[model samples]
Target chain A: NVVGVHYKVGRRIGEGSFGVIFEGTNLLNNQQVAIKFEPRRSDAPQLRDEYRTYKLLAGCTGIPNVYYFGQEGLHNVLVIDLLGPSLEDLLDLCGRKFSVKTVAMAAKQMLARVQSIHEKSLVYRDIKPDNFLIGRPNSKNANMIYVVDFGMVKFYRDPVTKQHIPYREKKNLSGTARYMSINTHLGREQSRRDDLEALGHVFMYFLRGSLPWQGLKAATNKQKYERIGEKKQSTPLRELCAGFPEEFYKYMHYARNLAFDATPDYDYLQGLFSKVLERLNTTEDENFDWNLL
Target chain B: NVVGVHYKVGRRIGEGSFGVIFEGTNLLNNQQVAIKFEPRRSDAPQLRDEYRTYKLLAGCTGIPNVYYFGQEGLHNVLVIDLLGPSLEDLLDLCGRKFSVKTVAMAAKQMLARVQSIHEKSLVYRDIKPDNFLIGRPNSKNANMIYVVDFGMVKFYRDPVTKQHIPYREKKNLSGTARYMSINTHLGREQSRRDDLEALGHVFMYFLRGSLPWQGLKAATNKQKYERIGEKKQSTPLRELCAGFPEEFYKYMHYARNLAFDATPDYDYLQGLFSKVLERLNTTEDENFDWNLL
Candidate 1:
């Protein structure tokens, strides 16, 4: 019943370890949809997590609507809003590169989505290219971007005792190693500040197409920590921001400060992002000023 | 309808970030059960995964049975077979010490469960005492041990493309750090051997009441990994096995040999374990014969 027997399925649009994703249309509504088909006997926890994440973020702007979650024979199906190519796909199609202005504009839109979730006290723990969709490419609508995937949303909860009993809870380490916040890596509770730090990492990825922690990939934990410590001491915020614009690095500096030193200044961070967006809107060129770099 | 209205809830049997599990009974069957009450508005993946795991392992001896999975008001309810206490709880009650024979027996039973799943080409990628249950102390059935959690089972597919895709493919890290295999810690696809290695680690934990990988309480991946490598090297399996009988060390040697070099001689291991069990059965005292040591 979950599968539409009469509907016309278009070409495969996206593919991952789970399965291939196809562009399709609901015969009843004539609305476009994205269909993902996975094996039915697969691990249900992973499938449920993916579906629940989409359901939680359903009507939010820049996120796809999950129209259906069902099983068709031996196939587990997920029908979501048909979106344009992912940001990574877009970048690849654009020859593995983008102007700084374009990157900044996309980053702004992505940050706004993170901000929306943060406002609700939920942290989007995973923020990477694979989780973003670009609506238009190389045109006036090119900068339009959407945040996809909420598989790592961690809501903040107060540590409160029930009745007369005190509860002691253990912390958990969650999210990807490269993009994770230092606190999250340390097994701290997911927080709003962690989300901002992750967002900053995403921004850095968009700009540089790599991560600061890339070289530490195969290193032992002690070696990796030593590297992190080395980076912190030698670079600091100013040195880490040396190549970027004063304004752009200013925002990044605030994010890095929040990541390593203390909780982020939310109001200041928000205002800084707002100014970045305003600058992008006022700029005539569709590219970031390389001279500033 | 799924909720047993007449069964009075008692003190919580367990508590985790997701919810509290209370001791309860079915009014209809008068059967003891553990009721896990989670908020419906809370993240669904955790509940779904727990239910799926329990359901899959039901009727499999030494695993918990799920009597019910449903909703009560805005809460997700999971009713499962009541297990008296966890192995960790038993260890605490026993003053943090167990006889070597008892530890060996528990390890053997745990290995049997892993062998069952390994034969099915599935890996119980996560193995820890928190997922194990033991019978009430002083009870004739005290030797019973149950492996409860399957939230981290990883199904391996045929590697035609050299890509080891997981049956439950989620974009998040699946296993806990301390017991995680080197492959899992490296973010590689978990294999059958990984489960065995983790079983070895769990066995070591049961014997020592501590992990070879210490300093996990530290707040960085680097520090955590450093601690793991250092401690694992420091507590070599050979050194730890010195106090056990020669036959027991044979199995330990085989397991450690597989850990160092990636091939396990299953027949040799089984023979070694059988002899150890035979010798332990003849002893009224729980301690192993130290003459072999």
Candidate 2:
């Protein structure tokens, strides 16, 4: 199907947390893009919301640039920059464990991407590895980490007063169970901490290979998540970090400890990983774990 | 059973990773102590080695002071300071999630203990929550974190040249699977980084309640560990650190990235957590998670 008159949708490439993602091409210039489709007749729709969120991050590095958002017959469609594989795919390619040098290097870019999103007053509630993709090969951002898939994003502050949203509870969890913040587990409204904490979990999963609560034993999905929440609460930092570095623990501890409205120290977080590169006795060579593997 | 001619062994307290532990008392002064017993007939005995390891940190802050080591009827026995509940027990009491403030405050003392051991040319390979206990209530060190159970401890450096042991691999894993270092997972010789990395894991487990790789799927014990190693390698740092501070990630990243014989910057690790306290807008109050519980 043709979207926005100029882009022709091709075969399905993958599925996102919210919708089916397909490869597309600009008929006029033959440039590639990613098309996300959500049926208009669905019980609830979110592609429009994701488009709005993308607009807030227009021109920001590591954020996909949108080209069009409109109806294409029975569905609402979004056409944006087509990037490389998600970190999840890359992890599999690297046999699951990313080297410290690779994670530390990418962290600089990841932090910047999240910081820019936060600067726009929006929190990317879904910050898992699958949502972060490397740029297309042979492009300007070929080696850059792009933050993508923002269907569950929420504004953390008011535009006029810029006052942060008041902290409250009694909300449903908004992100992946394995990477959600403790507050999210408690059903509290997610804030910037939620995004940051989710990001830290992504980092740990990259280095540690699997999270402790991944295979939680429970009869139902609800019970499984409840057990995951309990496990997240009970797993001591030392035990969780067994063979990794102290920086990972320090990062998670800082992220988890953030107050609901506290502004994250993006510089501090970035610098922490920068030091990781230094201690590795090397510098960021833009050589990710996938490249080495 | 009596030990060391004057200490009266009482009811069983618990088991160390290496031996059975029992409550005891100094008959002459009524001082409470913990006695460990290892049957002489056992294929492997570690109580004597543990006693010697404890002596390495004589007068150290968190290490227990050894009172006596002698032969009993059928076992080799060692008596030392009696302490409060372990971090593991405290984690249970707190329902598994320790507050960042509590973990950050405790980290100061944990780092000191690890540093002291490193300074004594030893690497306490068993750096888990269970091996670390809080001091007994109503005592000078009551609020302090005590490093205990040294059966798995090893000398990382030679006293003559203070030269660190050469890096080598293809050996058996020595410590607990849940918290051993990545190098250890690779069958590397344990060093200061191994201990520090494990400590960082402990910190994260305390804050996040679980590691990503705690529950592995495998058929054999060796295969399970092999999978654990694989998981540690494949898990990304950001995912591992979800919903926590950047400091925790930084700590683990730094710990996992260290060279085999590289000296750990204990102060830097401690400072990372100190900043966690500052970010929390509080100083160390010595109120652990257990206290709040």
Candidate 3:
């Protein structure tokens, strides 16, 4: 399919809840990129908003560069920098397990990516393994991690006054149920804290291979998320961070204690992972678990 | 020299401006350590203060653990962890040139070390290559980067009020003239920003192998420091960060722009180096320039 006027969409690459992703080429310059397409009639339209967020985060590292965004033949289209595999894909390649070394390396970049988004006054409500991708293989940024899928991003701070958005309750969960903050599960307004707390969950998942609350039985989506949230809260901090250094424990404790409007100490949290690298006597050297494959 | 009870000092390992370093053993436990000793009647007594600072920083990852602090014969002694080698020594072993990748790896750990000091409301006034060391070879923390020599370390904030110390001027230079901040060169009281700014210089030195103001000739010590300060100010940012990415330039710019009392954005500054790693498509695998040796 020809997207816009100068783009030729190739074979299907990926399919997710939002839409289908295709490898595409810029006809004018012959540059290859990825095109994500969603039908205009979808129940929840997000491509336009995602495009706008990308534009706002222009020039931010760990964020993909968007080439074009427009409607073409009854579908909303977004062309972005093509990246390598996602963390989820890498986990599968690595036998569903990750070494603490690999997790620590990813942790620093992931925190910086989230910090960049927060610096722009936006909260990335949807944070999970699938949303974080590596750069193109054999390219200059092969080791760089990129955050994608900004469909659920929202502004948590006012632009004019720089005041934080007022906290509210009874809000629907915005991201994946398995890897969200407890507050998000409790229907509280999402903010920078939520993003960071969710990232903590992501790290734990990588280390332990799976979270305890996964694969729970529930009658409805609401029941499922609630059950996950309940399990998350009920799990002892020691149990979640068990068999790991105190840094992981400190991370969960600190993330949980963050005030709604308080600024999270991104450096301190990032340092926790770096400390793990030191504690474990390892270097980040790009030896990701999947690299062995 | 026998230090305290059940400690035996052995062959001298190093000699510095303050005193000599000797390898030591804990007779009671048969543990090997290092002992630093300075004369009690010295013009400036520093070992005691350094020992106290280390105590304050106890449990800090990069700061070595001190085992004893007391008088031994005509000297003040401090027994501490035995580390591998200083960055200065490592630089010499690597032919005095480090790759961009090595410097980037060192930069993150160095910044985090500074942040840990700052967290305790202290400012590490001396930030030179010699003060940063690696972990002991063949140990669990072999790749860990450590900060030593707290002789000039001081509190930048009040312990009771938790408020930043008032900015002052006409204060004597606190750290090495070559690596101190411009404000410190101007006889201003040093603070957290000074530590970070000094760290920026440290990173640049590792990248370029030398500073523009190195080895300046002057009539006296005062004249030499003054000339170094002048040359540092006159040197263009573009020139110092030449042949490097904009992140280095941004680091110096942001460091220089910080207010005396303002908290430095340690995470943001560190992200600059991490960006360099990404921009260069490298992984920090402990492949320091000296690793080849």
Ranking 1 against 3 by TM-score, winner: 3
Candidate 2 vs candidate 3: the lDDT winner is 3
Docking quality category of candidate 3 according to DockQ thresholds = incorrect
Best-to-worst lDDT order: 3, 2, 1
lDDT (0-100) at residue B5 of candidate 2?
90
Cα RMSD of predicted structure 2 = 26.1
TM-score of each: 0.43, 0.51, 0.50
TM-score (0 to 1) for chain A, all models? 0.74, 0.96, 0.97
Computed on C-alphas against the true complex, the DockQ of each candidate is 0.01, 0.01, 0.01
Tens digits of per-residue lDDT, candidate 3, A1-293, equal 47778987753456666767766678998877988888787486668899999999999998899999888777789999888778987775555768888888998999999999999999988889999999764367877889999888888998667899998998977678989999988899998888888999999999999999999994898799888899999998889999988888899889888999999988888888889998888877766664431
